[PDB]
Design a protein around this ligand. Structure first.
Ligand SMILES: CCCCCCCCCCCCCCCCCC(=O)OC[C@H](COP(=O)([O-])OCC(O)COP(=O)([O-])OC[C@@H](COC(=O)CCCCCCCCCCCCCCCCC)OC(=O)CCCCCCCCCCCCCCCCC)OC(=O)CCCCCCCCCCCCCCCCC
Ligand SMILES: CCCCCCCCCCCCCCCCCC(=O)OC[C@H](COP(=O)([O-])OCC[N+](C)(C)C)OC(=O)CCCCCCCCCCCCCCCCC
Ligand SMILES: CCCCCCCCCCCCCCCCCC(=O)OC[C@H](COP(=O)(O)OCCN)OC(=O)CCCCCCCCCCCCCCCCC
Ligand SMILES: CCCCCCCCCCCCO[C@@H]1O[C@H](CO)[C@@H](O[C@H]2O[C@H](CO)[C@@H](O)[C@H](O)[C@H]2O)[C@H](O)[C@H]1O
Ligand SMILES: CCCCCCCCCCCCO[C@@H]1O[C@H](CO)[C@@H](O[C@H]2O[C@H](CO)[C@@H](O)[C@H](O)[C@H]2O)[C@H](O)[C@H]1O
Ligand SMILES: CCCCCCCCCCCCO[C@@H]1O[C@H](CO)[C@@H](O[C@H]2O[C@H](CO)[C@@H](O)[C@H](O)[C@H]2O)[C@H](O)[C@H]1O
Ligand SMILES: CCCCCCCCCCCCO[C@@H]1O[C@H](CO)[C@@H](O[C@H]2O[C@H](CO)[C@@H](O)[C@H](O)[C@H]2O)[C@H](O)[C@H]1O
Ligand SMILES: CCCCCCCCCCCCO[C@@H]1O[C@H](CO)[C@@H](O[C@H]2O[C@H](CO)[C@@H](O)[C@H](O)[C@H]2O)[C@H](O)[C@H]1O
Lengths: 558, 100, 80, 73, 61, 494, 188
């Protein structure tokens, strides 16, 4: 259904050149992704570690479908950013069912709603995300080396194109260039690793490699040393793609240069597919019998990456003053927790791995929505600060400095507490959801002997909490440098709004000021649903955690 | 003896103050064991309180002659002062000791 | 807690937060229908979570019995 | 917040307090500061701990009479 | 004055025979075995899930 | 529903009402304040209803609700005679905390009231939950609203002060998390009834102790580690300082009766000499530097360190007397420290706008009523008979001595040095010359608001100091289950 | 046990650790922004490689030495080699406080890494039933009185049945005084 969607949307956008026709193609991309959710939802009526499909080149798993649907919904939420205008005009005179359904409002909406804004004009933007999503849901279900390679390239190439799609920004084109040139080298590593697998085993099928590793794991002419050496090169490429230290210098630069709409998608979607794929590979490459094979375990690179990502991600973030560079480093410290849970392969670590990935993808999404909504909010505000004057791409990334968020509590108090509740979840303070994720990862590590890494993790969590509090202190501890626009409320400045009826006859005229312009409902509702999930998880934890306990019960079953 | 008060029935332990032959996964029995040890230790220390109250009256009754007339009370009180302390149950719950 | 109760309230909480983030007034009369709609969606999602709960309980029950056969049957074969 | 009553704030005393509140920014590791920082933090508490270790359960006065000994060990 | 008045009113009496208020008070807060019956059930179930979480988390790979 | 959930929901209902009245009206801030204060009266009303129905010698948790719907994280609310008085102190203190700071907030009044109503929920929870992982959840949920209570309504050095308490309390609490996680993995749950049954091996208990003690030494705090308190308990608003000292300081006092005494007894016994050495040092070094403090509010904060050491040494005595004296001195510090922050941070700082003791002198001449209450509060801080503080110190010191006689003798120096700092501060401000010449104009004496919150707090200290059995009767039976030991002719009966 | 040649092993760390730092100086020269030349790796960045060589040689040698001196193999030696490593780390910066600070920071890590077990490689597997091990430690609620007494000892309020008669013996053996408390009652 994702493939029928790309071809149909491609044919429609191929015969049109109209840019006003982009908002509607993004709405259909949300409806298209809803049919995919109805199909994968109905494909969850079986128990199996896996079923090889399409000649064995693909597999389907209960963990595979759940992640396919999670990917589709995370995609439907980012798509809303390009499917609805940023601000709306609301009056209590037009707020009932009869009005919103049978009456209509007419006013000059162009400058209020930013109708010809950049993010509302690219026509291929809904299509490019759908080709990234396709590579992600193929990588999850790959049973062969070639399939892995062809899927990772389908996802990687579409991420580069998304990062270059603001063609008229020097920043965006620079970032896409850095991403492609460092991403291409990462792909050589992934290709080198798979090639050395087939060239020593004669097979491209993962299950055959799993059995060749299964027969070797027993406590003479053909030692299987290649599997752990091949997979260590192989994981180096996937470590770069998820930006784990040491291969992390690219993410702060690319995530800050490309537009914020885009960095929502690029900074979430690639980790979800890469981390789910690695988990199955770690489970079947385990050495149950302590032999010489486990001394060269490829999982050590993930243990060193996690250790380095915990330190680098929390130390280097202390001196950042740019919010998107700050959030890029915060993601590196979160992959240090995801990577530890993956490295300890136990029933408890996998359940904690599954929870951490889903909840972090959900919460960092709220951190991106809150940032984009605050940027759109300052349309009715003005500032005289000399430093904000010199920022670049002020339209593609409206909020760029952490000092532009000074006194936001004074402008919007609950938007500030949504950003507080989300940031305190990154810190890991109870009763917030992000606590219950780090609790599980630490308990998994302690139960299985990773006491040394746990103490490192809780130390860096104090260090990483320093730069999170600097954001909170900046939004609440000071007075804003942003003042209301004086012209919007001038007493003489009003815009006339006409209430019609079904047969286009005036019902009422109304006089409106800038006080009648608000955030659009798709953004406000999405923020409130996730802030509430983070704040109220302790009262709604059974279905989410039980899904993970059942999923790891099958992967480890028998 | 003094009639046993009505309030002295709802709190009267029904069980010997021990843990021998007490299943710990049976919570009601285990909690009642704990309660039975706590109350014996407390009755023992309140027995000293009452003997000490009698000793006090004997002391003021006899004055100079307290050194000869109140020694039986002295003996009982000095026995309770080393025999009885409220030590809890936590040690007895977590250790089994036998005469052998 | 009751799921139908928590989820109905969760929908009412989501309406209050959305108006607070928009800074629009809570409780204007011509828009009060939103609270019933948000609550009804909270009721419905939760009837769906109760069906999820029921099935997960059967599965975890079965698995804890299967792990109690594997541990049992292995001990049976180790008695030789 | 509330306006307070008029105080002849002393320029001398204000800067004395401003000295104390900011004092720690200027602490240095010298041979003198290490000596005090070593005696108070290590020696004196180590000395107290040693006496606390060697006298633990050494004496009990409970119920002890003449002919019995305070020492329990 | 209030302390002396209330204190004299609430005295039990020569030998037993508590007041109507006293009989009311001890009645409402009886809970003769109601706490013990409820805590015993909860301890049983939380012991049961202590065992069940070991079984599921310690399964053979 | 259980009656222990009503304590939790009322402040939650009160937050809702403060945020939804302006929608029924530009409403006044006076009506914001009345709602929050009424809703803390109701919690106090309910909490006394819970106390009338309590059973002073019952070894089962009381006011429990049978859940029988198990999940991963479920709230279990039980009240016990070792936790009842901590709950009562919380509910008596929080109305005075609101009344004390009634005219001093002046801005963001809704946010101020919503934080305190939030705080009262979380601090009520921490005494009511029946799990040690649940305990940790609420023991650390108080951290975000306190970062904002200090940075929005705090004094000049508020930013560094808010970072200090948050980061120190976050770090210290994450070593307690590792030990709780170990206990749960070994036992399978953290529900109290299943933990107290279980006995850990000595080496494990020696390593769970290192982890629960790192946290509580960070949260007592002991001398080497108290740099957050001397900032947070001073830069904070007056209402923040009352909660922080009276209530938050006791989270670790009550957390030793749950986390250490019943489940790690062999470790507690064999390591007590390390605790006592630390406790003795913080009785001296804190007492020595409370003499040389030129900030009045900082002098009161430093006094709390010396007091907390005496109760920490009491909870590690393995004696019924030092354990009850530790709860009594925790309660005693609650009322008395509250009053001295009301005097320091809420009256002199209201009138002078300074905390430097150099500007004060002879305040008896123009504020006789302030002097009377300031002296009674100062004598309780000095541990003088007829106050509840004296009883708590007498029983705390006795158990410290019976357990390890040398440290109790160095702990008893407090008797001398608490008196020396308390009288010296009182003599410098109320007495000590004439009305100071830095006071350009005269200063009014106590208002009817200032009189009646000091009078209320002082009254609790005296009547509880005359008849401590009001609190001792509940403690005796429940405290009698954290003592570890046997006597030869009284144990192992047949 | 089997003694180990400290000098040999000590050099191995110097080449192993120093070898890596030589690769770091190679990065420094490759990223030099001027025409500094190839031999600059041994002139401009030589001190970078020397400090790695110094730290590597001190650690493995001092640890292997301390292993020989104590006639044991345990987590402790990874400490001693660690302190002498951080000690050499601070010798370069020429500040006395950093010599102690680096040594404390360095040595505490290496002892902590070893005592906690080798985490960065394969953690040791006991190869036993985890369900039995966890379930035994959950239902091991009571212990033999003798077992607890060894760790804590009789006394300090732990007076096991018979403590007085034993105490009589203990005092008689040490002080040499027969215990005979007074009746404290003039009759019988
Ligand atoms: C775990 C999570 C568990 C969750 C449990 C439940 C929690 C509560 C969820 C409640 C969801 C309510 C959805 C409907 C809604 O927004 O109602 C208010 C909505 C807008 O009212 P408003 O917020 O006062 O905005 C005034 C104007 O409409 C001006 O508004 P506007 O032009 O800015 O945008 C209007 C509209 C734009 O969207 C639409 O037009 C909806 C199209 C649906 C097809 O906005 C939305 O409906 C956004 C909904 C986002 C939901 C997903 C978030 C994630 O009421 C309507 O008039 C909509 C029609 C009634 C609902 C029909 C569709 C229901 C199902 C929607 C699924 C998506
Ligand atoms: C806190 C962050 C929240 C962010 C926003 C998203 C919140 C929800 C997060 C994920 C929860 C699980 C959603 C799984 C997909 C929807 C399934 C569902 O609720 O009903 C299944 C049902 C299945 O219906 P059905 O008709 O196929 O079911 C047939 C079987 N019987 C009749 C027995 C029930 O709904 C669907 O049709 C699935 C697709 C719905 C459209 C897309 C929804 C996306 C969400
Ligand atoms: C100011 C200080 C004095 C305050 C007033 C004191 C008298 C009023 C007491 C009010 C409370 C009522 C009460 O308990 O009174 C007890 C007793 C008078 O009542 P009565 O009926 O004699 O009680 C014994 C039973 N027949 O009265 C008493 O027992 C009074 C005892 C007062 C204290 C005596 C000295 C102790 C401290 C030195
Ligand atoms: C805020 C978070 C709220 C909760 C979000 C998550 C709720 C949904 C979790 C559902 C997954 C677990 O719940 C359960 O899992 C198993 C295994 O995958 C699946 O179970 C399925 O397979 C079995 C086996 O043949 C079928 O007989 C059964 O009819 C079918 O439902 C379903 O998916 C679901 O019944
Ligand atoms: C000093 C700073 C503070 C350091 C301690 C902090 C809290 C430590 C908690 C107790 O220490 C904890 O002990 C338990 C049980 O012995 C260990 O848990 C154990 O589980 C398995 C069970 O099969 C053991 O085989 C293994 O040795 C170990 O992983 C934890 O890995 C360790 O962290
Ligand atoms: C308020 C807390 C009080 C308790 C803490 C202090 C208790 C001090 C108790 C001291 C007495 C203990 O018991 C006491 O041991 C000391 C040990 O030297 C003995 O003291 C004696 O020892 C030697 C013999 O070895 C004698 O020659 C010497 O004259 C004398 O010092 C006493 O004969 C004995 O009675
Ligand atoms: C986990 C997150 C951290 C936990 C701690 C949560 C703290 C929450 C604080 C309360 C919520 C915000 O509190 C909010 O403050 C803003 C300040 O602009 C107030 O907003 C109002 O302030 C003043 C009040 O006179 C008005 O003049 C102004 O026009 C208006 O903006 C809101 O009426 C209040 O509700
Ligand atoms: C600063 C940090 C200092 C050390 C921090 C705690 C280190 C914990 O690492 C330590 O490892 C040893 C050996 O596996 C374990 O210690 C214990 O293990 C098992 C239980 O697992 C016990 O039966 C055994 O008696 C004991 O050796 C614990 O797991 C932990 O005490």
């Amino acid at each position: 259904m994702i493939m029928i969607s790309i071809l149909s949307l491609l044919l429609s956008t191929s015969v049109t050149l109209r840019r006003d026709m982009s908002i509607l193609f993004n709405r259909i991309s949300i409806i298209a992704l809803a049919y995919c959710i109805l199909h994968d939802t109905m494909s969850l009526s079986f128990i199996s570690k896996g079923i090889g499909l399409h000649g064995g080149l693909l597999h389907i798993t209960n963990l595979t479908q759940i992640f396919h649907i999670f990917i589709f919904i995370i995609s439907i939420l980012i798509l809303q950013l390009t499917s609805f205008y940023p601000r709306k005009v609301w009056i209590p005179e037009y707020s009932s069912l009869k009005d919103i359904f049978f009456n209509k409002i007419l006013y000059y909406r162009t400058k209020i709603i930013n109708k010809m804004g950049e993010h509302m004009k690219i026509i291929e933007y809904p299509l490019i995300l759908l080709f990234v999503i396709s590579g992600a849901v193929f990588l999850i279900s790959t049973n062969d080396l070639v399939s892995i390679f062809l899927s990772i390239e389908l996802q990687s190439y579409g991420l580069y194109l998304l990062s270059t799609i603001y063609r008229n920004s020097e920043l965006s084109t620079t970032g896409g260039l850095i991403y492609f040139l460092l991403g291409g080298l990462s792909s050589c590593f992934i290709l080198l690793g798979t090639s050395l697998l087939y060239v020593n085993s004669g097979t491209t099928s993962l299950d055959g490699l799993y059995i060749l590793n299964s027969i070797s794991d027993v406590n003479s002419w053909y030692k299987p040393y290649y599997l752990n050496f091949s997979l260590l090169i192989f994981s180096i490429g996937f470590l770069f793609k998820v930006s784990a230290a040491p291969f992390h210098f690219w993410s702060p630069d690319v995530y800050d240069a490309i537009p914020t709409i885009v960095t929502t998608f690029v900074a979430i979607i690639a980790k979800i597919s890469i981390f789910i794929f690695l988990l199955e590979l770690v489970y079947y490459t385990n050495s149950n019998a302590n032999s010489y094979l486990s001394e060269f375990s490829w999982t050590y690179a993930l243990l060193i990456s996690s250790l380095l990502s915990l330190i680098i991600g929390t130390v280097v973030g202390l001196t950042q003053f740019r919010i998107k560079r700050l959030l890029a480093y915060s993601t590196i410290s979160h992959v240090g927790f995801i990577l530890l849970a993956l490295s300890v392969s136990s029933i408890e670590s996998t359940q904690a791995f599954i929870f951490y990935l889903i909840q972090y993808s959900i919460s960092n999404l709220n951190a991106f929505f809150i940032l984009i909504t605050i940027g759109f909010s300052l349309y009715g505000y003005v500032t005289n600060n000399k430093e904000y004057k010199s920022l670049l791409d002020k339209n593609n990334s409206p909020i760029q400095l952490i000092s532009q968020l000074k006194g936001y509590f004074y402008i919007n108090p609950l938007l500030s507490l949504s950003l507080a509740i989300t940031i305190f979840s990154f810190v890991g303070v109870p009763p917030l959801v992000g606590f219950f994720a780090k609790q599980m990862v630490l308990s998994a590590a302690l139960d299985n002997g990773y006491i040394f890494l746990s103490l490192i993790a809780i130390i860096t969590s104090v260090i990483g909490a320093v730069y999170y509090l600097n954001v909170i202190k900046e939004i609440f501890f000071y007075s804003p440098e942003h003042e209301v626009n004086p012209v919007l409320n001038e007493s003489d400045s009003n815009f006339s709004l006409r209430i019609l009826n079904e047969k286009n006859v005036l019902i009422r005229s109304v006089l409106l000021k800038g006080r009648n312009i608000f955030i659009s409902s798709p953004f406000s509702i999405t923020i409130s649903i996730i802030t509430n999930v983070i704040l109220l998880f302790i009262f709604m934890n059974k279905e989410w955690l039980s899904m993970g306990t059942i999923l790891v019960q099958i992967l480890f079953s028998a | 003896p003094t009639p046993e008060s009505e309030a002295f029935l709802a709190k009267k332990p029904q069980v010997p103050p021990t843990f021998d032959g007490v299943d710990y996964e049976d919570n009601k029995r285990l909690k009642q064991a704990q309660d039975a040890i706590i109350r014996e230790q407390w009755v023992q220390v309140m027995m000293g309180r009452l003997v000490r109250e009698e000793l006090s009256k004997c002391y003021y009754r006899e004055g100079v002659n307290h050194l000869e007339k109140c020694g039986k009370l002295r003996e009982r009180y000095l026995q309770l002062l080393a025999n009885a302390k409220v030590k809890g149950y936590l040690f007895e719950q977590q250790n089994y000791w036998s005469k052998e | 807690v009751n799921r139908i109760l928590f989820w109905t309230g969760f929908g009412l909480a989501v309406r209050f937060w959305q108006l607070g983030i928009e800074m629009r007034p809570f409780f204007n009369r011509k828009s009060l229908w939103a609270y019933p709609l948000f609550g009804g969606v909270g009721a419905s999602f939760g009837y769906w979570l109760q069906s999820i709960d029921e099935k997960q309980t059967k599965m975890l029950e079965e698995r804890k019995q299967a792990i109690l056969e594997k541990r049992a049957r292995r001990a049976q074969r180790q008695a030789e | 917040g509330l306006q307070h009553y008029k105080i002849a704030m002393d320029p001398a005393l204000v800067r004395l307090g401003s000295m104390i509140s900011n004092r720690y920014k200027y602490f240095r590791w010298t041979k003198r500061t290490a000596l005090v920082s070593f005696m108070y933090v290590v020696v004196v508490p180590s000395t107290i701990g040693y006496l606390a270790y060697k006298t633990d359960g050494l004496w009990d006065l409970r119920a002890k009479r003449r002919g019995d000994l305070i020492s329990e060990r | 004055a209030s302390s002396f008045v209330i204190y004299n009113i609430s005295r039990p009496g020569p030998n037993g025979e508590p007041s109507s208020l006293h009989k009311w008070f001890s009645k409402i807060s009886d809970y003769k075995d109601e706490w013990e019956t409820r805590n015993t059930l909860m301890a049983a179930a939380l012991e049961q899930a202590a065992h069940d979480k070991h079984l599921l988390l310690t399964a053979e790979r | 529903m259980s009656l222990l959930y009503v304590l939790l929901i009322i402040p939650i209902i009160g937050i809702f009402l403060i945020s939804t009245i302006d929608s029924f009206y530009f409403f006044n801030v006076s009506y914001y304040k009345k709602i929050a204060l009424i809703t803390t009266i109701l919690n106090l009303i309910v909490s006394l209803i819970i106390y009338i129905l309590f059973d002073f010698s019952n070894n089962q948790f009381q006011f429990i609700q049978e859940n029988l719907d198990l999940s991963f994280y479920d709230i279990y609310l039980g009240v016990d005679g070792v936790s009842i008085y901590f709950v009562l102190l919380t509910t008596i203190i929080m109305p005075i905390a609101l009344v004390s700071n009634w005219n001093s907030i002046t801005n963001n009044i809704k946010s101020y009231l919503i934080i305190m109503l939030l705080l009262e929920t979380l601090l009520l929870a921490v005494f009511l939950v029946l799990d040690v992982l649940l305990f940790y959840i609420f023991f650390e949920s108080i951290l975000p609203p306190l970062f904002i209570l200090i940075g929005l309504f705090g004094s000049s050095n508020k930013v560094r002060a808010s970072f200090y308490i948050f980061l120190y309390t976050l770090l210290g609490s994450l070593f307690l998390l590792l030990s709780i996680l170990t206990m749960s993995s070994i036992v399978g749950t953290t529900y109290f009834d299943v933990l107290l049954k279980s006995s850990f091996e000595y080496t494990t208990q020696l390593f769970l102790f290192f982890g629960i003690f790192i946290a509580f030494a960070v949260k007592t705090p002991v001398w080497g580690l108290n740099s957050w308190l001397l900032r947070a308990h001073v830069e904070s608003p007056l209402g923040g300082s009352i909660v922080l000292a009276a209530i938050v300081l006791k989270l670790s006092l009550y957390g030793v009766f749950r986390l250490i005494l019943p489940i790690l007894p062999q470790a507690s016994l064999n390591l007590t000499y390390i605790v006592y050495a630390i406790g003795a040092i913080t009785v001296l070094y804190a007492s020595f530097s409370t003499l040389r403090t030129v900030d009045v509010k900082e002098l009161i904060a430093y006094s709390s360190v010396a007091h907390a050491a005496i109760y920490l040494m009491g909870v590690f005595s393995n004696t019924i007397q030092g354990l009850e004296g530790a709860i009594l001195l925790g309660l005693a510090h609650g009322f008395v420290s509250s009053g001295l922050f009301i005097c320091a941070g809420g009256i002199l700082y209201d009138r002078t706008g300074t905390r430097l003791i150099y500007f004060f002198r002879g305040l008896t001449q123009i504020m006789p009523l302030f002097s009377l209450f300031f002296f009674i509060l100062c004598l309780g801080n000095a541990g003088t008979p007829l106050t509840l503080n004296f009883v708590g110190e007498f029983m705390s010191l006795y158990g410290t001595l019976e357990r390890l006689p040398i440290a109790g003798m160095l702990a008893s120096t407090s008797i001398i040095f608490s008196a020396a700092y308390s009288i010296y501060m009182y003599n410098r401000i109320a007495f000590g010359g004439s009305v100071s010449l830095y006071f350009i104009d005269c200063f009014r004496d106590l208002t009817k608001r200032e009189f009646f919150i000091l009078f209320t707090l002082v009254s609790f200290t005296v009547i509880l100091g005359i008849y401590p059995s009001f609190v001792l009767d509940g403690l005796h039976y429940n405290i009698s289950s954290v003592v570890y030991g046997i006597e030869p002719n009284a144990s192992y009966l047949t | 046990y089997h003694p180990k040649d400290a000098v040999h092993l000590g050099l191995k760390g110097a080449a192993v650790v120093g070898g890596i730092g030589l690769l770091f100086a190679a990065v420094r020269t490759s990223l030099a922004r001027k025409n500094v030349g190839p031999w600059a790796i041994f002139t401009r960045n030589g001190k970078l490689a020397a400090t790695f060589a110094a730290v590597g040689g001190a650690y493995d040698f001092t640890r292997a030495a301390a292993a020989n001196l104590r006639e044991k193999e345990d987590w402790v030696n990874n400490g001693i080699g660690g302190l002498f490593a951080g000690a050499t780390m601070g010798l370069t910066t020429g500040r006395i406080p950093r010599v102690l600070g680096f040594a404390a920071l360095t040595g505490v890590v290496l002892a902590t890494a070893e005592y906690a077990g080798s985490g960065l490689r394969g953690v040791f597997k006991r190869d036993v039933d985890e369900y039995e091990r966890k379930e035994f430690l959950r239902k091991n609620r009571r212990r033999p009185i003798e077992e607890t007494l060894a760790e804590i000892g009789e006394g300090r309020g732990i007076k096991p049945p018979g403590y007085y008669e034993r105490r009589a013996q203990r005092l008689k053996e040490k002080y040499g005084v027969d215990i005979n408390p007074v009746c404290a009652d003039p009759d019988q």
